[PDB]
């Protein structure tokens, strides 16, 4: 019945998809998950702030849990400093991962990675929820913690955790990587905060800082420590040809990346086009209004729009926030906007160019949108019809 | 490559058996009707008695019991107050034991362990009221689980606690449920309540089993305690050409909670509590009673689960261990209480001590010990003939 | 008539298999060429890091690793000195763990236990220089294993320590060796070094894991530590009509060292540490850490190894026990360290705890415990699926 090149390829993917899923299911059922420490180091960022960690080459790697602790001292004679909106999420400035073939996966900021960790959890990442329980549950272990203020002459202790994903989730191995069978070494690069990035003076932009206040100039880290734990699957199932492996899962990249866009003007639609071919699962837009971060009051509306000028969700800021409250049970910090496209990823070539839109009500000097994306990127095929 | 693997399934066999079990379970859930019914209420003074044997009704398939406990505590001290211990009202029931119609025991554990499992299964502090910014007045309106933070000298405090004693694993998984329609032989739900000797701890005394601790403890007493047991079961069971359509695997499997105590800890040395064979351990709770002191991980180097030959499958520092727990219950368990979820892949050794729970302590005080709590499945016959806990 | 006997050999069988294995081993030893090669060197400050994962080269049959460790220790105290503990430089490495290309662990033990086994295998203090009356100037010329007896206030001492991490049992017995030519999958040699928190013990503190102890300990610190790992392997493996001629039993057997800790000792009562089944225990080391005090047998009534049916096979007073050790290493191990050689007839229970190591203490201080160290062979598959240590 004269199936076309398109039809045949499609057909030979439907079987590919099924084979992949089955392989994934078998790997998950037969292998056993392991999480083990890879490396720990304690240092003063005044000495060194960039570290290249070398993960162990074993089985299928799903991701890394990075524990970061720090001690900060405010030696100002009289003034305190207070946490910025991102606070300890800025202990790590940037994270970059390269697999055994030296293919780069995620490359983004600590704050963006943290917001995605929260979005994926459905609540502030590793937080302790407050309840009326008389039994003493609560913030017992201070998993993620930082003092609200550090007074002149005081030293505060902070703890922060980041999950650097390779696999999309515990059950979806899309994006996972791969030492079964040796052979191909990296790299998990961690770029930490230092005295220059962590402390912002009054009036300075707090975006990348941990603390801001009149005592900023005299604040110093005493030390930072990190411990990287690698999560992977061991005892990979073997069948007939060798390892039973989800080939599509392992040849797909699940990455986070961020960028900055400028050119905003009052009451005009600022459109950030989605960079085609990627399957965008989520989008985070931070309106850094010249160092000011506002709770929606500087925005008329936000939206996702496709090439016909047709908006799929043009919403006022509070209604946009309402959708996010359904996703993470609370609001992201001032000026941070989130958009979930997990079930139907934004994918140009499926419906023309798409763009993320912000129509600002007020635009200060040096205003810009910091965009954070979560996406899958796959093998691209072209056909002759 | 902790070992035996997925060959445990090849061994049970009766893919036909499982297929049937599961189909029958679904028919029962679809056809029967859920009922929650009061079976007994009683008010008493702990000075006279504190152990009661409740007799459940023998009807349909029993899933579990919801036990409501209320109490009034009077601090008769002249000038000193007392304050809630970390477990507080969770210690209103000291122990629970359930015997089915065939004289087989299921759960036998402490009230606090039962409560922590209730929390683990809910995914949040059991029957708690979450705080939100809602302007609509939702909140702690009904004081479902409640206890005064302190009871001042001369004051009387009112407490309310609830426990769910499970037979069935969940509302949709009847593994562990009990068929009680079939024999006149009685069930036994034994409850041992707190009393004037266990509920109050003097300053400096171990608060593990107490509800309140403080300078006025010696003069605290129960005015009275009351309990109401509600039985949850399925009625109107579906019948077929065989008769009753029943999940035979579900009903021949025991879902139990059990506790134990282990001692012999030494600074910087791995303390290993072996898991027994034949049991499929779904969760493990380890409480580090460091000689009466309960610390937030500062007295521990790391915790882990280890298989003899491979090494550790999750050797983690205390905070990272706590991080995994935060993903399960959205908060931390009380100080010194550590949880481990193995629900998707239950610890199942086939040989005794193949699988151990590890705690390497940083500091060990006098009379230190680990109080273990387990959730497991078992083949009722295997527990009858081939089972211990406890690795010395 | 400790029991099962020489029927253990009838059971393995492959008299054809063993005959072949041994022949293949001899061909490999005869045809291949031994190589010792540096794989990694590193210098660091313990204040920043002390745990390293060394990646061995995947070539031929790996026999073991020679680890050279050098360190400079500065006593910054104003006026107090420190002196070597009994283990001294043997504590420069706190722990070692080796994982083969198949993710299977072999040795997982302490630096001091590894060192004592190195000594037991050599038949004299490992890499030591024996003193003789020779007028020719042989002697401690090269300071192979060396450490200042004391480091005075304000002084800096230089130390050198060597450890042999074995995979193969010996240069002629390849049991336990690892074939690393065959997979791109990496080996892992994990080393945890002493740090400023473990190397120095204050007067009155437990010196077990420390290098120096004394009044100036609080102000001692590492200037730096350096290590160099040398890998010993066989290259140019012989090929036949099959391909590689290899001793399959040797390469499928694990030769491991492991340690454990046991507590619960009471004056004049037999303290028994059970041996696990499946493992063929070649040697046992028991260190009586009597609450931080290490005595030369005066706190012990007797030691023994005991078998169900016969009684003890060697219940001996401490001096007579030490006499047997003098025949093995030509001297005594340090105070409180006891050795037992079972190389010719390895302890092999088939049932867990059939055999135990016994210590009947004369005096027991607070926080007393026995730190056990074992050398054993195992069938790599048996350790994977059926193994624990330790009967409490």
Short mmCIF file of C-alpha atoms in Angstrom, two decimals, chain A residues 36 38-39 53-58 179 181-186 230, chain C residues 37-42 49 51-59 62 64-67 96-101 167 178 180 183-191 193 227-233:
data_model
loop_
_atom_site.label_atom_id
_atom_site.label_comp_id
_atom_site.label_asym_id
_atom_site.label_seq_id
_atom_site.Cartn_x
_atom_site.Cartn_y
_atom_site.Cartn_z
CA UNK A 36 27.20 7.27 47.13
CA UNK A 38 32.00 10.98 45.25
CA UNK A 39 33.96 13.83 46.79
CA UNK A 53 34.54 17.07 40.35
CA UNK A 54 35.13 13.70 38.68
CA UNK A 55 32.11 11.37 39.00
CA UNK A 56 32.72 7.62 39.20
CA UNK A 57 32.07 5.69 35.98
CA UNK A 58 29.47 3.13 37.02
CA UNK A 179 29.46 3.85 32.61
CA UNK A 181 31.25 -0.48 30.38
CA UNK A 182 33.81 1.82 30.81
CA UNK A 183 35.52 3.94 28.99
CA UNK A 184 34.68 7.65 28.77
CA UNK A 185 35.51 10.17 31.50
CA UNK A 186 34.54 13.76 32.21
CA UNK A 230 26.21 10.40 42.78
CA UNK C 37 54.15 0.88 37.88
CA UNK C 38 53.30 4.24 39.39
CA UNK C 39 49.67 5.09 38.71
CA UNK C 40 49.23 8.23 40.80
CA UNK C 41 50.97 10.69 43.13
CA UNK C 42 49.45 13.58 45.04
CA UNK C 49 40.70 17.06 52.05
CA UNK C 51 39.59 11.15 51.08
CA UNK C 52 40.83 10.15 47.62
CA UNK C 53 39.60 7.75 44.96
CA UNK C 54 42.53 6.40 42.92
CA UNK C 55 41.82 4.94 39.50
CA UNK C 56 44.07 1.95 38.73
CA UNK C 57 45.08 1.10 35.18
CA UNK C 58 43.00 -1.62 33.49
CA UNK C 59 45.80 -3.89 32.30
CA UNK C 62 46.25 -7.02 38.84
CA UNK C 64 47.92 -5.49 44.32
CA UNK C 65 48.90 -1.93 45.11
CA UNK C 66 51.89 -0.60 47.02
CA UNK C 67 50.91 2.67 48.66
CA UNK C 96 41.07 1.54 52.44
CA UNK C 97 38.39 0.14 50.13
CA UNK C 98 38.85 -1.55 46.77
CA UNK C 99 36.15 -2.09 44.11
CA UNK C 100 36.93 -4.22 41.03
CA UNK C 101 35.68 -3.57 37.43
CA UNK C 167 44.14 -8.59 45.49
CA UNK C 178 41.68 -9.28 39.27
CA UNK C 180 41.48 -5.91 34.29
CA UNK C 183 36.34 -4.17 30.51
CA UNK C 184 36.64 -0.37 30.17
CA UNK C 185 34.79 -0.22 33.56
CA UNK C 186 37.05 1.40 36.15
CA UNK C 187 38.56 0.05 39.34
CA UNK C 188 38.29 2.13 42.48
CA UNK C 189 40.99 2.23 45.18
CA UNK C 190 39.56 4.45 47.90
CA UNK C 191 41.93 5.86 50.51
CA UNK C 193 43.98 9.52 55.23
CA UNK C 227 50.98 9.54 48.55
CA UNK C 228 52.14 7.55 45.57
CA UNK C 229 50.33 4.41 44.46
CA UNK C 230 52.23 1.73 42.56
CA UNK C 231 50.22 -0.95 40.77
CA UNK C 232 51.59 -4.50 40.52
CA UNK C 233 50.28 -6.62 37.68
#
